[PDB]
Every structure is written in C-alpha cells, then in structure tokens.
Scaffold this active site. Structure first.
Site, short mmCIF file in Angstrom:
data_model
loop_
_atom_site.label_atom_id
_atom_site.label_comp_id
_atom_site.label_asym_id
_atom_site.label_seq_id
_atom_site.Cartn_x
_atom_site.Cartn_y
_atom_site.Cartn_z
N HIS A 161 50.49 37.98 25.29
CA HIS A 161 50.39 37.48 26.01
C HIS A 161 51.38 36.31 25.99
O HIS A 161 51.69 35.49 27.27
CB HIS A 161 49.06 37.26 26.50
CG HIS A 161 48.89 35.99 27.29
ND1 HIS A 161 48.41 36.60 28.94
CD2 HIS A 161 48.43 34.81 28.09
CE1 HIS A 161 48.69 35.39 29.76
NE2 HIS A 161 48.15 34.06 28.87
N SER A 219 50.64 33.98 33.44
CA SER A 219 48.73 33.84 33.27
C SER A 219 48.03 33.34 34.51
O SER A 219 47.80 34.09 35.36
CB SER A 219 48.30 32.97 32.11
OG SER A 219 46.90 33.29 32.11
N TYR A 220 47.35 32.48 34.41
CA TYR A 220 46.88 31.74 35.89
C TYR A 220 47.96 31.32 36.96
O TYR A 220 47.05 31.35 38.15
CB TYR A 220 45.40 30.72 35.63
CG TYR A 220 44.56 30.53 36.58
CD1 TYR A 220 43.43 31.11 36.26
CD2 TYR A 220 45.02 29.91 37.89
CE1 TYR A 220 42.54 30.87 37.23
CE2 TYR A 220 44.04 29.86 38.73
CZ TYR A 220 42.93 29.92 38.31
OH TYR A 220 41.60 30.04 39.87
N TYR A 223 50.42 26.33 37.00
CA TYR A 223 49.56 26.78 36.42
C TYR A 223 48.74 27.06 37.31
O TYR A 223 47.87 28.13 37.99
CB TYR A 223 49.52 26.38 34.86
CG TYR A 223 48.77 26.89 34.07
CD1 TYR A 223 47.11 26.55 34.08
CD2 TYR A 223 48.63 27.51 33.49
CE1 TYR A 223 46.37 26.65 33.52
CE2 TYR A 223 47.56 28.81 33.04
CZ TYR A 223 46.44 28.08 33.19
OH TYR A 223 45.44 29.22 31.73
N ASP A 280 49.81 43.07 25.74
CA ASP A 280 48.77 42.18 26.18
C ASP A 280 47.52 42.42 26.11
O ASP A 280 46.60 43.24 26.90
CB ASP A 280 49.18 41.43 27.49
CG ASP A 280 48.80 40.07 27.91
OD1 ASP A 280 49.73 39.25 28.48
OD2 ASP A 280 47.63 39.78 27.21
#
Ligand SMILES: *[C@@H]1O[C@H](CO)[C@@H](O[C@@H]2O[C@H](CO)[C@@H](O[C@H]3O[C@H](CO)[C@@H](O)[C@H](O)[C@@H]3O)[C@H](O)[C@H]2NC(C)=O)[C@H](O)[C@H]1NC(C)=O
Ligand SMILES: *[C@@H]1O[C@H](CO)[C@@H](O[C@@H]2O[C@H](CO)[C@@H](O)[C@H](O)[C@H]2NC(C)=O)[C@H](O)[C@H]1NC(C)=O
Ligand SMILES: *[C@@H]1O[C@H](CO)[C@@H](O[C@@H]2O[C@H](CO)[C@@H](O)[C@H](O)[C@H]2NC(C)=O)[C@H](O)[C@H]1NC(C)=O
Ligand SMILES: *[C@@H]1O[C@H](CO)[C@@H](O[C@@H]2O[C@H](CO)[C@@H](O)[C@H](O)[C@H]2NC(C)=O)[C@H](O)[C@H]1NC(C)=O
Ligand SMILES: *[C@@H]1O[C@H](CO)[C@@H](O[C@@H]2O[C@H](CO)[C@@H](O)[C@H](O)[C@H]2NC(C)=O)[C@H](O)[C@H]1NC(C)=O
Ligand SMILES: *[C@@H]1O[C@H](CO)[C@@H](O[C@@H]2O[C@H](CO)[C@@H](O)[C@H](O)[C@H]2NC(C)=O)[C@H](O)[C@H]1NC(C)=O
Ligand SMILES: *[C@@H]1O[C@H](CO)[C@@H](O)[C@H](O)[C@H]1NC(C)=O
Ligand SMILES: *[C@@H]1O[C@H](CO)[C@@H](O)[C@H](O)[C@H]1NC(C)=O
Ligand SMILES: *[C@@H]1O[C@H](CO)[C@@H](O)[C@H](O)[C@H]1NC(C)=O
Ligand SMILES: *[C@@H]1O[C@H](CO)[C@@H](O)[C@H](O)[C@H]1NC(C)=O
Ligand SMILES: *[C@@H]1O[C@H](CO)[C@@H](O)[C@H](O)[C@H]1NC(C)=O
Ligand SMILES: *[C@@H]1O[C@H](CO)[C@@H](O)[C@H](O)[C@H]1NC(C)=O
Ligand SMILES: *[C@@H]1O[C@H](CO)[C@@H](O)[C@H](O)[C@H]1NC(C)=O
Ligand SMILES: *[C@@H]1O[C@H](CO)[C@@H](O)[C@H](O)[C@H]1NC(C)=O
Ligand SMILES: *[C@@H]1O[C@H](CO)[C@@H](O)[C@H](O)[C@H]1NC(C)=O
Ligand SMILES: *[C@H]1O[C@H](CO)[C@@H](O)[C@H](O)[C@H]1NC(C)=O
Ligand SMILES: C[C@@H]1O[C@@H](O)[C@@H](O)[C@H](O)[C@@H]1O
Lengths: 733, 727
Positions: free
Chosen positions: B701, B591-592, B508, B669
C-alpha cells in the site's frame, strides 16, 4: 464533387465492430456424398454432386429446450444428435458442458440415463452411435443413448489423475486437444491415456470474477514449468463390445518402449491403423528421440502386443523431432504400410513411405520445399499440401501423387485462380470422393467444391462477393511478399503497404513479430486485422519477417535457434528492420515493433538490445524468462535448465537482464491477469526489473483476461489502447 | 535561479533535519549523532557518548534498533529486521549487560521473535514468539512460557492480527505491563473463521512459481476475529507449574454480539481500564477492573462502567479516546464530544456516571499529552479558530479557567503546528514545531515554562533553500452553507494572480481527515508548484476532522457522497478565484484519496480534465470490516446494503469517458487489495473507456520501495504534464 474515387479507409472501428466480414463456408462431411451446413440457423444437408439441399433439422426444433445450444454433434449413423449447452470454457480446447441426446427417428429427447452435467468431454464412436464421455476425470461408455453408462475408470481425481482427458501441458503443448480418447475405426475398442500430475507444481493466480465476489478466488493449475516434474502417462485399450453390467471393465495396458521407460517421456501420438492395430508415438523428455510402436490385438489373449521389429525410431541431431511434435502416420488400408512426413537427409520435410516390418522408408517427395500435411490417402493416390509452388514458402497448394509412380504428381489448386489464390487448405469427403478447397488469399477467401475422380470443379460455395462489393470504394492496403538475402539464404518478409504507396515517401514502420520456432509470418493469406487499419488509415507500413528459426523452409533455418532461444531470431528481426530502412521508403526515426506471446518476448528482447533501431514497441503477454514457461514447449528448444545441460543460456536469455537498455525506447507492456499459459508472473518480473533500473514505460493489465485477451470488450480495449500508443509514438494526430 | 525539482524530491537533496530524542528519566534523553548514541542532560545541554559505534563492530550483524531497559542496566539490540504489515515485523534480539559491557549468550531471545518489550520499571522482559507470550525475569534466565495456544494465522497471544493491528491498536503488540511491572495484561485474538485474502507474491526473478500470500482479513460484513483478555502475575511465576492467566470478560453489554477490545490503560498497580466497542461502532463501554487480593481474580464492578455512545455517528475520531488517570486512579480525564459535538476533555470520577468538561468552545482538543498533580497539558486547535494549527496548552487543575498557551507566542510567524514530548515525569518537554516555517525543535522546563534552548533550527536547510525558487503556501477558508471549510494551496514562486495556472487538487478526504494545515512539507506538490508552475490545492469538506461532529459525522453511513461533492464544489470555487485555468484542473489521491479521486472523475461534473488514483478503494465490501463498518454499518438488506452498492466507482464507469484517468496499484497490497483496482479496470474495459494504468509488482500500500517510489512519482509527473500540455 468526388467523382466516385475511393475516399473511405479501413478504420479502427471497422476492425473492432467487424464492418467488413469475411464469409466462411463451414461444412461437416457426414458421408462420402453429403455434408451439413448452416444457412439462417437451420441445419441443411447438401448433396455434393448436385448441390440440392433440404432441411435436416429446422431452426425451431429445440426452441422449447430451455437453454441456448452451443453446438451439436450428429452420430455417424445419423440416428441421434448430441446437443451441447451450458458451455463453460476452460483452456484453449477444454471446456465443460451439459448434453442431451435427441433421437432423430422418434423426434424425441432422451430423458433416461442422461449424460451428467459438468461433463468434460463426449465423443461418438466413429461408426454407429456408441458414446464415450469423461466426467469427474473418469471414462464412461454408453452403448445406446437411453441405457445406463458403463464406468470404465474409477481412479479419476481432480488435478491429479486424468482418464480420457489431458492435463494442462498435454492439452496445450502435446495433443492440442483436451481429448485423450481414441476409438478404433469401427468402435470395438476405446483407447485412452491416463495422466498422473501428483507431483506437478501448481501455478497459482488470482481470479477476481464479477464485482459481486467479495474475496478473489485463487486459481490453482498443475503446470510444469521448465525443468519441473512432469505428469506421467499410461496408455490403455478397452473392448467396448465386451462391457458388462455385472463386472468392471478390463482396460488393457500398453507400456511405452524400454528406451522411453528409462526416463521421463511423453505419449505424443495415437493413430489407429486397422480395427486391430494401433500405433503409438512416444517422445523422450529431451525431445530429439521418438519411438513409434505398432501394436496388434491378440484374439486369444485379449491383450495387445507391440513387436520390437515393428518399432520405428525418429531422431534429430540438429534439434527436436517434428515441427512441434513427431508427425502422424497415414496407414494404407491393410495397415501393413504407412506414409508420414519426416526430415530428409537435407533437412527438408517430405513424405516417407514405410513398410511396417522395415527400418528403411523411402521418400515419395523431395526438393527444397516442404510438405505441410498429408490430407487424404486412397488406394491409388495420396493427397497433400505443400509450399512447392513457385518456391514460395508462404504459399499453400493441394497436390496429388500416384502411389504407383512418384514421378506423376499433379497440382490440383495451383492454377484454379492464380492471381487470387495461393493459400489452400482442403476438407475431403468421408472416402475422398469429394473435397472442399478453401483459399485464404491473397485475394478474398474463396470456397469451392470438387469431385476427385477427375478433379473438375462442381461449384462455388462462397466467393465473398458481398465483401468484394463493400470494398470497392475503400482505400485498402496492399501486401508485398518477397525476400532478402542474408549469408546466401533467402529470408521472406511481408509488408502491408498503405494505399497509394509511394516509394518517394518515408513511412513509419511497425515490425509485427512472432518468430518462435517453426513460425511463419510472411505468407499469402488475406487478412482484415489491426495491421489492415494501421496501413489503410494511419499510413503505417506493417512488416513481418521470417528469420532463422522460422518454419517450412528446412531444418537448416528452423533448427538454427536450437538450445539458443532469444538469439538469432531476435538478431534477425533487427537486421530485417535495418534492411527495411535501406529500401528507401522507411522513416528511420519511426520504426516500432510489437508482438504477442513469443512475439512479446522477441519484441522485449529487441527493445532491450541497445540496437538504437526501434523508437518503441508493444509486448503483449510476453514470455520473459524461459524457466517461467511450460516444460514441453521450452525444453523442446532449450533442453533442461541445469548446469549440466543449458542453464547458462536460460539465464542469458531473459528480458529482465536487458532492463537498462530500455532507457532508449518507449515500451508498452500488456498482460491479462488470468493468463494460464504465459503467466502474468512473466510480465510482473519484467515490470519489476524496469522499475529497479529506473526506466519509465507504459502498462496495462487485463483483469481476468487470459492469453488471448479475447473477450469482446477486452479485445476492443487493447487494440484501442495500442493504437493510441503507436500514434503517439509516431506523432500521428 | 534553480527550482525544486522532481529529482530533488526523489533524491532528498534538501533534507529536513529532525531532533528525535527518547527520554530515559526525568532529566536525561538519548540522541543519535549520525553515527553515535549520546546521553544529554536536559538541564545543562551537555552530552557524553553513551553508546559508541564501535561497541558492536565485532558483532557481525547489522543493527536496526536498540532499547535500554528502564533501570538502565541492559540494552536490547534488534537485528535481522523483517517487515510484516504497517507496524508488525520480525527480528532477532541480543541483550547486552551495560555495567558488565558484554553480550548475554545464555537463554537468548529466539530468532523470528514477533515482539519484545521491557517492563516499565526494572528489567523484566516480555516477548512473543510463534504467537506465544514469554517472560524473562532477568536477561540471562530461562523464560517462562505464558501461553500455549499460539498458532499461525489462527491464535494470536500478545500480538494483533491484521485488522486489529491496522485499524484498532495501530500497533502489533497486544501486551500491557502494569506500571511497576507486577502484572502483564494481554489480549488473545482468535481468527479461526476469518476469511483469508489471497494474492500472488512474485518475489525475486529466481522464484520459478509465484507464492500465494494468505492473510486472515475480514472484509465488510465478514466474520471477525474474537478477542479475549488476560492478566498474569509475573511476580509469582514458576519454573514448575504453568502460569495462570486470569481472564477479564467483556461486559454483558458487549457480550450480546460481535465486539472489539479497543483500549487498554493501566490506572494503578492494581487497577486496569479496558474499553470495548460493539461491532456497530456507536456504543462503547469502559470497564474498570480491580485486582482482588484474596481471590487472585480481577473484578469489574458494573457500577464502574462508563458508556460512550454516539447518536450521529461512530464513537471517537477513529476509536474511543484513551483515559488519563490521576495518580490515585480514582479519577481520569478523556476527550469526548460535548453536547455541541466538539471534542473536549471531560473529568470522570471512577464511581460516577456524569463527567464534567474542563474545556469548551468551537474548536477541539487533539490529545492529552501529560497530567501532573497540578496541571493537564493538551494540544488543541484553539489558536485563532484555525482547525489546522496545533498548540500546546496547560490547564490549572484547581481552576479550569486558568489556561496558559505554552506555544502560541514562541514564534507566531514560523510556528503554528506543535507536537510535544515530556520527560518521564514532565520535568521538561521538547517542543516540535512543524510549520509553516522550517521545523524548529526546542527544549523547555515545565516548572516555569522557560525555553532552555534551541535543539534544532534547520539553519542549514534554510541556507540551501535561499538559492531555490520555492513555492509558497496559502491556508484559508471558503464559506459553504454558512460554514467554514479550510483549504490550502501550494503556490508557484513569483505567483501572479493575473495569470491562469493549472490546478491539481490533492485529495484524501476520509472521515476525520485533514489535508489543509500549517505543516511545512517538501514533497511531490513542492516540485509541481516550483518547477511545473502548478497550483496544488487540498480541501477539507464534509467528513473532515477536528472541526466538530456536525462536519465529521455528515458522511455517516453515506461514504462516497458529501465528501466527494465537496471536492468538486471546492474546485469550482477555486476556478472562481480568477488565477486558475479551468481547462486544466486535475485531481489525485491515494487510498481513500484514490477512491474520492475516482468518484469525482466518475461524477460527470465536467470540472476535471484528468486524474490519478493510487491504490483506491473501489467498493466498500472489499475493504476491512473495522474501518468500513465504522462509517458504513453492515452491507445487509436490513442495514446499509443499498448504499454499499450505490457508492462504488465501478458504477460510474461510463462517465470516465469524459476524463483522462491513471490507475495505479501495488500487487502485494495487503490493505487495499489489488482486487479493488482490478474491478475498476474491468468495469472501464466493459464500457469501452480508455485509460492509463500501472501495477507495481510486489509493492504494498505504501508503494514505498526506493525504486518503486521513484518510479511512481516519475510516471505520475509525466501524466500530469502531458495532461497540462507542459513540455
Ligand atoms: C477459536 O474459535 C474456534 C471456533 O470459533 C474454536 O473452535 C471450536 O472449538 C470447539 C472445542 O474445541 C470445537 O468443538 C466441540 O464442541 C462443539 C459443541 O458446541 C461441537 O460442535 C464440536 O463437534 C466439538 O465437539 C469446535 O469444532 C471448534 N470450532 C471450529 C474449529 O470451527 C477454537 O477453540 C477457538 N480457539 C481458542 C484458543 O479458543
Ligand atoms: C500417481 O502417481 C504417484 C507417483 O507420482 C503414485 O504414488 C505412488 O503410489 C504408491 C503406491 O500406493 C505409493 O507407495 C507412493 O508413495 C506414491 N508416490 C507418491 C505419492 O509420490 C500414485 O499411485 C499414482 N496413481 C495412479 C493411479 O497411478
Ligand atoms: C470390428 O472389428 C472387430 C475386430 O476386428 C471385429 O471382430 C472380432 O472381434 C471381437 C471383439 O469383441 C471378437 O470377440 C471376435 O472373436 C473377433 N473375431 C473372431 C474371428 O473371433 C468386428 O466384426 C468388426 N465389426 C464390424 C461391424 O465390422
Ligand atoms: C539464530 O539464527 C542464527 C543463524 O541461522 C543461528 O546460527 C547459525 O547456526 C549454524 C549451525 O546450525 C552455524 O554454522 C552458523 O555459523 C550460525 N550463524 C552464525 C552467524 O553464527 C543462531 O544460533 C540462531 N539462534 C538464536 C537464538 O539466535
Ligand atoms: C504446561 O502446559 C502445556 C500445554 O497445556 C503442557 O503440554 C502439552 O501437554 C500434552 C498432554 O496433555 C502433551 O502431549 C504435549 O506434548 C504438551 N506440549 C504442548 C506444547 O502442548 C505442559 O506439559 C504443561 N504441563 C504442566 C504439568 O503444567
Ligand atoms: C447505532 O446505530 C444503529 C444503526 O445505525 C442505530 O439503529 C437503528 O438500527 C436499527 C437496527 O438495525 C433499525 O431497526 C432502526 O430502523 C435504525 N434507526 C433508528 C432511528 O434507530 C442505533 O440507534 C444507533 N445507536 C445510537 C446510540 O445512536
Ligand atoms: C437430393 O436429391 C436426391 C434425389 O432423390 C434425394 O434423394 C436427396 O434426398 C436430395 N437431397 C436432400 C439434401 O434431401
Ligand atoms: C443437470 O442439471 C439440471 C439443472 O441443474 C438438472 O435438471 C438435471 O436433472 C441435471 N442432470 C442431468 C444429467 O442433466
Ligand atoms: C468396480 O471397482 C470399484 C473400485 O475399484 C469397486 O469399488 C467396485 O465394487 C467394483 N464394482 C464391481 C461390480 O465389482
Ligand atoms: C539429444 O540432445 C542431447 C543434448 O543436446 C544430446 O546429448 C544427444 O546427443 C541428442 N541426441 C541426438 C540423437 O542427437
Ligand atoms: C549468417 O547466416 C544467416 C542465415 O543462414 C543470416 O541470417 C545471418 O544474418 C548471417 N549472420 C550472422 C549474424 O551470423
Ligand atoms: C551468459 O552466457 C555465458 C556464456 O556465454 C555464461 O557464462 C553466463 O553464465 C550466462 N549468463 C548467465 C546469467 O548464466
Ligand atoms: C552533563 O553535564 C554535567 C555537568 O554539570 C555532568 O555532571 C553530567 O555528568 C554530564 N554528563 C553528560 C553525559 O553529558
Ligand atoms: C507493584 O504493585 C504491586 C501492587 O499489587 C505490589 O505488590 C508490588 O510490590 C509493587 N511494586 C513495588 C512495591 O515496588
Ligand atoms: C450545505 O451543507 C454543507 C455544509 O454544512 C455544504 O458543504 C454543502 O455544499 C451545502 N449543500 C449541499 C446541498 O450539500
Ligand atoms: C442504491 O441506492 C438507492 C437509493 O439511494 C436505492 O434505491 C438502490 O436500491 C440502492 N442499491 C441497491 C443495490 O438496491
Ligand atoms: C442440482 C442443481 O441443478 C440445477 C442448478 O441450479 C445447479 O446446477 C445445481 O447443480
């Protein structure tokens, strides 16, 4: 120690980098004697007779222009040249651009009253040098390139009212052109169409653009999906000779026949017959009924009038009218008569001769083959292309028939080069004194010049000897063109066969399909494409099959899928594959299918059929359900999506309903996100359906690519990606 | 001899049992037996059916949730739930008199209500509808309309817009009742000039033309929503004049530019604290506002302002911490970074600038959980210097060195990650242990901290698990530059260090993230380790949280640098541990994590064979302003534009030629726009890099629809297996 045996193959990089180039010979006839051509970027003028050339416009004339010139157009009188730059593509034919006019006798640009930037279309009059252009959806005319323009229309409105240009559907499906302007033969009259898209719903999609754009753009285009409200159309003629700087121009409206006004209809063809006679073809929203009006100018009135006794009706009880639209008429000089292709009583398309005042036309050609197109008409001869030669539907030759005796028909191309040439097209000089023949196969393309007086050959324009030289030690594939018989009917197919083809082996087979109505995928054309690489390098047989619904073989075959898309045509590809395996040289465990557009639809329908015949397949930009596609194409074959018409079949022919059967195959779904033609929506719904029943498959979206996925980099990427997928599927290293 | 399979994960064969309770008072709480609402007495362990399933059989609608008024006399029933963003949703509501056991059919809460909440005492009701606030003094009486400015996508009263919901409040609601329900504080958001993100929503196959969703969403450097604060007296409402909301203006220190409202906390009946944050998020101010009896106004003494700023980064973990006021409200406790950069509890007196730290050390206070007149309860990672452990402590307010760990010793082998839920007045507390063993839920009395009883021990799951070859979990640290960095490894069953295993780095790595911890999980990694014999590791490098500012702030203004490099270095270390096949190292993240995965794969490190990025950020200008600017400043020549342009995945396109990449993104998203992956894919196409891709139509998302969730994990499993030559 190779002893000069061919050891090279036609590889993926060869295709992607265009290592082997087909040379073309593209000319523009400026008169009945001369034509323009491009050598090493200069504009040469050739004399058809002798072949002597000189420079018409040196490649240095505009090197101070300041912009890159996309194209040029020379006025018919050869006094001016239109330079096109700042070209920005829109749909398949449309685009905007800037233009400057260069006067050829003063060797100077015109700096006064220039054509505006963001011009949507420009066209010279057919004689002289008048200019008509469309800007901001309005029509303008310039009588002389250096003088102020006359504004013809004032109603132009972005996405709503189009004057002189089409909206999306007309461009793509009705005209196949952006232009909706038609000059009279000598330039006196400017005819145009006006389209009103007020209540046409807008397809909306994202356009991501350069990575610089912080927020994506939403593109919004008026686009009638099946059963939605269509644009309306009006037709007008304006006398350009009576334009005035002190009064607005008078456009004379010509209304569609009452039998069209009763409902939704389309303007489907505009053909000038004489300086004062224009013919218009109208088509009802249910495309089995068209009316041709023939309208004469009235010197006193200043109006145009269409006589009911001159209306010609063209209808079909088995399907729609025309291959994709009613054919265009070719008027004799006096404009009292015309020739045109129509289905005869047996369903074969042949040339009919009409007298303007009469209902009964007479057929000048007949037989179980079809006339592809009428190419030229003189006082004594009509020239046409047909697939009569050797009864091969996928062959094309030029013929000439004596207008005074229909039994005197001569084939001009059949025997020029029989082993090398079986697919011809032609380009006639301004009054047919000469013609260029272009043969696309099955051998290397060959371009020749001919004089029609006694049809002898003048010379070889381009024979592709350089390509022939390069190919000598390359193991190229061969093509087999033949037919199979289903229910006492011949159905043609072609197979791109690996070099050193050996019937004793079992080759993996790829079915390359399109198969939409009136399609032809089995022909004598020579191609250097992905299939070429698959056969040559990967030893994959690539076959195509023209089944029910296919064209150029009569209405019985073509109209078989009427109101029933996604049936026989799909069933036939499957049956073809079965047939191909029974031939003895196909590996049953490695049969795949792929296609683009209608072809992606069939591929997907075939893969979702539960037939067990195909291990895998690739659908590129597939239609997935007919209600998502455009009204004029869809409704032509499917009628309306209403309970009272054909809704049941619309709902029965979606790929989404077959989702569960995809568990049996390996599927690769590809679509460009900026597809304005078959919307990404279509693939988005296929994927959601597959996801909903738990089938795993492969996917690739192409950011900002449209229906052609034709950007240089995207084109290379998609074929690379598809190649890995096929190789993986077939266990090829 | 069975392993934990993908299907097990996807179908939830082995379920972790929970013990979710909600306190109603200081000695009773509610519980939901599969089918049934019980009331439990905390003291004795005895229940009675409080709400029988059958009460609403004749209803005719399907019930999503319920809410008991604090006084216990009504129950709000929520139905027709329609999800919006992460926390926001729309629903219909009905109120049922409990003592009269009947529906209220008068003056009903409208359909499509955006938010509803009970006053903290009694049964007043506040709801937002069509972006306007409404108050109901009694369930059956007309509601008073407080605001009249509500306007779709433009004016939000009592609810947040997209960015405040997702990044500031972590809640849809922007309503705060005073402790006894006299006042209703609310924020108003104005998004008038906020640009909209637009994207297609394809909907059911029946929709002929796709819909275009349009959401006010400030990307980095764009115009932000503005905010206003108001307080309304609900005790002097009228049925004749419009309510009058008293505005509390942001401090002059905030008014000089763009700013945010970041925290609203009631201190007493007539004292409210508001934290404000400058758009450049290294400076925040706490205003303390008192109600003025004779003026009807709310005044915030400049002299009571409390500044919290940072010289090395932003303020707070993700935002300034919430204060916890003593009963009299003249004093409060809040977590701030001390002088060594470690987050600790500081004691403020409303009237003075300097606070005193009551905790200290090279570890962090995670949160303040309760405070009584005698003790402050908090969670920290102090136990054994392990940043990924969590334990409940209580500090004696009359002597700060008197600190009792309440959970460290309950079961050291099985329980090292606790969360807590105190009863309404901290009489009792439920302890929630999440690992490393099976979750264990227990109940305790705060008077002497004795264990009253085991609420849920997951014995059932424990028996099922005896059958399956379960992977194990190793949590340790490596040393980089004389600093510890923690990692975890999910190790296959019968792990043998003389063998070479494929390794998947699960990343992450966003700011203040923590991926190495003592929590027990049953997830995709479980399957990969158990069935596919893959080691799945995660590493907390620079930028990670809970270990002090020197580590957390190391990526300030430099996203996509140190945190990316540290994942690569960590992989390099793992390969030197001897049991890793260095030809089979992969990386994946969402995501990140998709961003970092992509930056790692585009790094040319040559360490990774392949990777999967799910809904990745690809360039910071595309992400929302609040989160992005917090770490990146503004994308302008005078600030940080250069690094915004230097930290894109697109710029590393050419290096993807060395790896196998799978890029996945949902088309709806609203958080990390599909746009982000669309730019990655285009850049890869432009340099002629082949790669794998998958869009998920209409997924957001979370790609969390049941079928999409199953489909994505299945697709990813095939890709990793193919990559690792696993048939
Ligand atoms: C939400 O923010 C909006 C813009 O920040 C704001 O709108 C602005 O409101 C004023 C007053 O109604 C409008 O204008 C008047 O006065 C200014 C002089 O400063 C003039 O320029 C205008 O012509 C006009 O006379 C603005 O036009 C308007 N700005 C817009 C619409 O962009 C809203 O009022 C805010 N909403 C709330 C509830 O506060
Ligand atoms: C374009 O088509 C629309 C109808 O589809 C025309 O709109 C009608 O115009 C009349 C006269 O002003 C109005 O009373 C109607 O309400 C319009 N119908 C609508 C808007 O649905 C419009 O006039 C046409 N424009 C042109 C130049 O033909
Ligand atoms: C081009 O065609 C037109 C139409 O056939 C010719 O002209 C006459 O048309 C104009 C239109 O402005 C009328 O005003 C005249 O009155 C027409 N004839 C008569 C008898 O009045 C025109 O001559 C043709 N041009 C060329 C170069 O052949
Ligand atoms: C909330 O929505 C429901 C459903 O639309 C409302 O009720 C319906 O109203 C129609 C007539 O307009 C009736 O024929 C339906 O039978 C009603 N549905 C039901 C289940 O009875 C309802 O009144 C709305 N208002 C509130 C405040 O909830
Ligand atoms: C209570 O407040 C509202 C909003 O300010 C008042 O209503 C609006 O007032 C205008 C006239 O100024 C009307 O034309 C609108 O129809 C009213 N409705 C809305 C929804 O704004 C309402 O009258 C107020 N009145 C009093 C007397 O306090
Ligand atoms: C808050 O952050 C800002 C920006 O990171 C710090 O400011 C400087 O910002 C100004 C204005 O953009 C520049 O002109 C300076 O060159 C920057 N450098 C320095 C060393 O300040 C600001 O100092 C930070 N505030 C706190 C309290 O740390
Ligand atoms: C070809 O020769 C003829 C004979 O004079 C000449 O008129 C013509 O201009 C020549 N061709 C070109 C293209 O100039
Ligand atoms: C068009 O644009 C060019 C450059 O933007 C400008 O110089 C020119 O004057 C414009 N107008 C025309 C008619 O070209
Ligand atoms: C031409 O028509 C337009 C719009 O109908 C009008 O505004 C303009 O005044 C007209 N021009 C003349 C010269 O009458
Ligand atoms: C046109 O098609 C419709 C629907 O199939 C049909 O009712 C009508 O008879 C057709 N017209 C002709 C001439 O067949
Ligand atoms: C019927 O005849 C057609 C050709 O006319 C042929 O394609 C088809 O296979 C036969 N089959 C079916 C299945 O009706
Ligand atoms: C499929 O076709 C049948 C008639 O053969 C029809 O009754 C049915 O409704 C069709 N499917 C759909 C989805 O309408
Ligand atoms: C809980 O147990 C006590 C017995 O001491 C009883 O008085 C109380 O009412 C019980 N109620 C419920 C709902 O469990
Ligand atoms: C709630 O607090 C306010 C303090 O202003 C008070 O007026 C109200 O009566 C309080 N609640 C009571 C007294 O129960
Ligand atoms: C030194 O800094 C950090 C720890 O403080 C470490 O992770 C990093 O790998 C080291 N060196 C470099 C050059 O980043
Ligand atoms: C990217 O960062 C480097 C310095 O780290 C800088 O020189 C470059 O200019 C930056 N980007 C832009 C767009 O200038
Ligand atoms: C008027 C200007 O012309 C030049 C260009 O910079 C732009 O096209 C702009 O329209």
């Amino acid at each position: 120690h190779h002893h000069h045996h061919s050891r090279k193959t036609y590889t993926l990089t060869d295709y992607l980098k265009n290592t082997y180039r087909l040379k073309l010979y593209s000319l523009r006839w400026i008169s009945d004697h001369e034509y323009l051509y491009k050598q090493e970027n200069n504009i040469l003028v050739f004399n058809a007779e002798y072949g002597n050339s000189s420079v018409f416009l040196e490649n240095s004339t505009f090197d101070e222009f300041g912009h890159s010139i996309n194209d040029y157009s020379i006025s018919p009188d050869g006094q001016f040249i239109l330079l096109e730059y700042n070209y920005v593509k829109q749909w398949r034919h449309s685009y905007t651009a800037s233009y400057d006019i260069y006067d050829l006798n003063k060797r100077q640009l015109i700096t006064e009253e220039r054509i505006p930037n963001n011009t949507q279309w420009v066209t010279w009059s057919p004689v002289g040098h008048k200019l008509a252009y469309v800007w901001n959806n309005d029509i303008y005319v310039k009588i002389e390139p250096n003088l102020p323009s006359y504004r013809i229309t004032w109603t132009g409105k972005e996405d709503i009212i189009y004057n002189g240009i089409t909206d999306w559907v007309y461009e793509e499906e009705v005209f196949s052109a952006y232009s909706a302007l038609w000059w009279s033969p000598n330039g006196t009259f400017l005819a145009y169409a006006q389209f009103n898209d007020t209540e046409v719903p807008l397809i909306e999609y994202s356009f991501y653009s350069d990575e610089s754009l912080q927020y994506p753009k939403t593109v919004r285009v008026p686009y009638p999906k099946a059963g939605a409200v269509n644009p309306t159309v009006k037709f007008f003629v304006v006398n350009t000779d009576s334009l005035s700087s002190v009064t607005n121009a008078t456009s004379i409206q010509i209304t569609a026949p009452a039998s069209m006004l009763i409902g939704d209809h389309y303007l489907c063809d505009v053909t000038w017959a004489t300086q004062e006679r224009i013919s218009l073809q109208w088509l009802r929203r249910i495309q089995n009924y068209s009316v041709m009006d023939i309208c004469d100018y009235d010197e006193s009135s200043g109006r145009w009038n269409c006589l009911v006794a001159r209306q010609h009706i063209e209808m079909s009880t088995t399907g729609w009218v025309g291959r994709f639209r009613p054919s265009e008429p070719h008027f004799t000089l006096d404009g009292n008569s015309f020739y045109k292709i129509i289905s005869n009583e047996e369903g074969y398309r042949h040339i009919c001769y009409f007298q303007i005042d009469k209902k009964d036309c007479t057929f000048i050609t007949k037989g179980t083959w079809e006339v592809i197109g009428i190419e030229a008409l003189t006082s004594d001869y009509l020239y046409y292309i047909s697939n009569e030669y050797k009864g091969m539907p996928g062959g094309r030759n030029l013929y000439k028939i004596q207008l005074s005796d229909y039994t005197k028909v001569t084939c001009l191309s059949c025997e020029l080069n029989p082993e090398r040439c079986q697919y011809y097209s032609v380009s006639f000089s301004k009054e047919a004194k000469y013609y260029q023949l272009r043969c696309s196969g099955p051998g290397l393309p060959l371009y020749t010049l001919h004089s029609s007086v006694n049809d002898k050959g003048l010379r070889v324009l381009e024979d592709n000897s350089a390509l022939d030289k390069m190919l000598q030690n390359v193991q190229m594939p061969s093509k087999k063109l033949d037919f199979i018989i289903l229910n006492e009917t011949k159905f043609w197919y072609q197979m791109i066969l690996p070099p050193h083809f050996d019937k004793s082996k079992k080759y993996p087979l790829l079915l390359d399909v399109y198969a939409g109505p009136c399609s032809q995928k089995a022909d004598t054309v020579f191609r250097l494409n992905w299939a070429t690489y698959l056969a040559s390098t990967e030893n994959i047989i690539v076959a195509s099959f023209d089944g029910r619904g296919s064209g150029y073989q009569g209405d019985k075959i073509m109209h078989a899928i009427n109101r029933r898309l996604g049936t026989f045509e799909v069933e036939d590809q499957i049956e073809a594959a079965r047939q191909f395996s029974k031939m003895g040289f196909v590996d049953n465990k490695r049969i795949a299918i792929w296609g683009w557009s209608y072809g992606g639809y069939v591929t997907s329908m075939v893969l979702g059929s539960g037939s067990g015949v195909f291990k895998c397949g690739i659908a590129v930009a597939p239609v997935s359900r007919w209600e998502y596609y455009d009204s004029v194409y869809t409704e032509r074959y499917m009628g309306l999506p209403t309970p009272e018409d054909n809704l049941d079949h619309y709902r029965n022919s979606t790929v989404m309903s077959r989702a569960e059967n995809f568990k049996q195959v390996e599927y690769l779904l590809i679509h460009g996100t900026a597809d304005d033609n078959v919307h990404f929506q279509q693939s988005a719904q296929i994927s959601k359906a597959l996801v909903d029943v738990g089938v795993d498959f492969q996917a690739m979206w192409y950011t900002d690519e449209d229906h052609g996925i034709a950007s240089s980099t995207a084109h290379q990427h998609i074929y690379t990606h598809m190649s890995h997928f096929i190789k993986q599927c077939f266990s090829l290293p």
